[PDB]
Amino acid sequence: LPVVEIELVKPNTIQLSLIEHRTADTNPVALPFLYKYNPADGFAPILEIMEDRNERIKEFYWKLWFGSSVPYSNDINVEKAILGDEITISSQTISEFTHAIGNKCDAFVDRPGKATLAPMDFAIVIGWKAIIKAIFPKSVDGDLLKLVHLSNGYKMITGAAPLKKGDVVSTKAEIKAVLNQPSGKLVEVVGTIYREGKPVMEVTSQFLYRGEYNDYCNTFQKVTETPVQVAFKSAKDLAVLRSKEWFHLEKDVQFDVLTFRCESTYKFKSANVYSSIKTTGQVLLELPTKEVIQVGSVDYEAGTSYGNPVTDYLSRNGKTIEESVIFENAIPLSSGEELTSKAPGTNEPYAIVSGDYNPIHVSRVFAAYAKLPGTITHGMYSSASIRALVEEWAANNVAARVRAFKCDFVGMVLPNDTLQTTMEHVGMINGRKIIKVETRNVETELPVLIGEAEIEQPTTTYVFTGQGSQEQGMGMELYNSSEVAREVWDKADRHFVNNYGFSILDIVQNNPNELTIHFGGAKGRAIRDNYIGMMFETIGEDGALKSEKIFKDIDETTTSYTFVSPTGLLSATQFTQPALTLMEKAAYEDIKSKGLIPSDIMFAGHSLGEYSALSSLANVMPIESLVDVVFYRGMTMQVAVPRDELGRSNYGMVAVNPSRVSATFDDSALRFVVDEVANKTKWLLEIVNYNVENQQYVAAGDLRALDTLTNVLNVLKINKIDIVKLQEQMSIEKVKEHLYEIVDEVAAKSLAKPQPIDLERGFAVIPLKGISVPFHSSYLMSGVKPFQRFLCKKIPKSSVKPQDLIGKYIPNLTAKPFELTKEYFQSVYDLTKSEKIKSILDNWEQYE
Amino acid sequence: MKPEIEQELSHTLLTELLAYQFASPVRWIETQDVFLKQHNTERIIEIGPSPTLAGMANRTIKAKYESYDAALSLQRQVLCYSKDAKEIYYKPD
């Protein structure tokens, strides 16, 4: 087919016409090039018609990118956004995008079943039509042949979902900047994408009219700022903010810090100096009890300025809300030859699927005319291939790692050329692990693509370690190696020293046998009345609710008090629990501003992910009233039952392990000890553990019933009379009296042995000791009155959000992703009972 | 559900857990079925002075999820803060 046509149209003028057949409507289009022949001067006999040349080029490119059907309108109003065209993402387009184009894996190949996976990089296919319409307007006048696509970027406002063959989405383009740099006009198009109203993707692209342009009246840059946080700590901050004439008072709360989400508008009169500045922005600062509501804005104008006061001020005080702190040293991610990619032999497939029919990519004559070396491949193709690459080689077949992707086309790639994309584990932002992506040609070594990868992992569960085995030096390595851990430990230590007369670091670092609080001057007496005032109000089991306060020893007369514990003070509840909450008060910590965060994290542990997992990932444990609450709870819980003369109660823990008796014992085989000891003996008992059931059963209660429950598995371990026969062979309802021999002997032998019992640690019985009050069962959350004294107050009632806590916690008191909404109400209400949520379950009132 | 209703629901039920989980039977069975089978966590991370759960997690993976991992080609990497500190922060030797 014709690709070049030189022809004499009218006397003495040439009409070199570059022909392009593969177009939007498969209709050949000519690109004229007027040329005055000069017989008079044979030294240079060909002058070129430079006037209207750019107009002709834009005419050609308009027919190419939009079709002959739509008329060419050079006049495009810059200020108004460029409307695209509402399309419907069909299954067909996703099925046939990939023939030689890129992403192929287990979910991107011809297989039966259901919806085939796809990448989001084909959002510019939706976008392209409107994005490129902002490089045409008369105000932005440039040579389209010399235009090079410089960069392209995608943002991650994830109101949407990945491609599922049937989405329905529209386009919305809007020009942001038209700069005049020494490289030429830098057109900035950040045309966003709407799926019925709600924005889905931002999609920023840069074009560069290579050359040199001096038109500065038609030059501007309306940049929108980020939520920039300033840094201050003083009362001079108010004075500084008042001194700023641009700022206007639109709030009534004290100032110490900003996090403005602003936006400005530049107008260049020369290379660097701005003809005018326009800034309107928004104002931000913290609100009451973590309960934030609406805010106000700002205003600013200028003229003939070398900078923007507002943005420079916000930056100068400090960096923005930066969820990206770069990791210390680099290691490889998928480096090697198993990350190399050969450029496609040709460019027509990606051109037809995407709609970019720029002949520079396909037509040899066009590429030669633009003086660039050969038909270079699409920058869009390279970006798409790399975005598919962040999911493909660094991952073991999971397609949930395709996200926001920033890219720039520093180099050029010829077709059928091999490229070594390097991907090194360097930076880190808020989950989407920043990895470099640099696509360098293998033989020239020059880079072509630069960006930062955002590859995820599958879901995970940050487990923890803690109560029940806690040792000396607990979490002191992080205390000595971390600034934030030092901060939290120091704050808690200062509060304990200033309010309770003991350092918690001293308890944790060098575990003492006993410690002495002293009640000295004003500080000491302000410490003493803390202990005087706080203590439980528990019903005495001899009548009604006995309103009482037992610290006993401490009163007005006493000037000291000694906390004593033989094995260790870190074993004592009042010091083991605050230490626990503090030592895991920092896990997310630096990964918080780093980005190692995998796909879906739940803060958990081994039933100690409710006291040490939910501040780094859930921020529930407030700041410093945490230690007060936990220490008060420790004391209240510790003196919740009558001690004897030697200081030990008739209550506690014991294990009744099923693994040792036989492999036969299962939930359908021995789930009877709990409801066959409480009913007759008229005691208190409930099983604490079947977490790893068929291998681990533990229980808590009054010590006699614990002995009775153990001497069921114990007596049926050396004799081995199966309970499967008792339960499923004959019947279930009828057999409610077979126990009244086999637990009767024990409910007698246990009384025969001395009342303070030290339960033996046998084969199928492995008690955990050092616990006096029965928790994890039914007497340390039952009628136990003053345990939830502080449960609708100081704790940040307004901070707790369903958004994170729902789904980002997994229930140890159930199973899968803890729903922290109505669905879970009767789970802490059946096996433990409650009265607090009876109201929310029944009395809903006026919640609407 | 409106955000303000569900935040009252939020704090109420979260207070209910923080009270009652410390006196209610722990059910780590289906939690294991979540981070091993149902939710498909291949990388599990533990932060603590000692690996108190890495060993027993390996025990359950071997005793219940060996053929399951072989069938679906899942390679589980268990990590702890005391020993596998280099793998958590991604610093190989």
Swiss-Prot record, chain A:
Residue ranges annotated for the MaoC-like domain, each copy included: 317-445
Region described as Malonyl/palmitoyl transferase: 424-644
Spans annotated as Dehydratase: 1-423
Catalytic residue positions: 607 (for malonyltransferase activity)
Job description of the protein: Fatty acid synthetase catalyzes the formation of long-chain fatty acids from acetyl-CoA, malonyl-CoA and NADPH. The beta subunit contains domains for: [acyl-carrier-protein] acetyltransferase and malonyltransferase, S-acyl fatty acid synthase thioesterase, enoyl-[acyl-carrier-protein] reductase, and 3-hydroxypalmitoyl-[acyl-carrier-protein] dehydratase.
Family, per entry: Belongs to the fungal fatty acid synthetase subunit beta family.
Quaternary organization: [Alpha(6)beta(6)] hexamers of two multifunctional subunits (alpha and beta).
Name assigned to this protein: Fatty acid synthase subunit beta
UniProt lineage: Eukaryota, Fungi, Dikarya, Ascomycota, Saccharomycotina
Curated annotation (Swiss-Prot), chain B:
Domain of life: Eukaryota
Subunit record text: [Alpha(6)beta(6)] hexamers of two multifunctional subunits (alpha and beta).
Similarity annotation: Belongs to the thiolase-like superfamily. Fungal fatty acid synthetase subunit alpha family.
Summary of the function given for this chain in its UniProt record: Fatty acid synthetase catalyzes the formation of long-chain fatty acids from acetyl-CoA, malonyl-CoA and NADPH. The alpha subunit contains domains for: acyl carrier protein, 3-oxoacyl-[acyl-carrier-protein] reductase, and 3-oxoacyl-[acyl-carrier-protein] synthase.
Name the record gives this protein: Fatty acid synthase subunit alpha
Organism in which the protein naturally occurs: Candida albicans
The encoding gene: FAS2
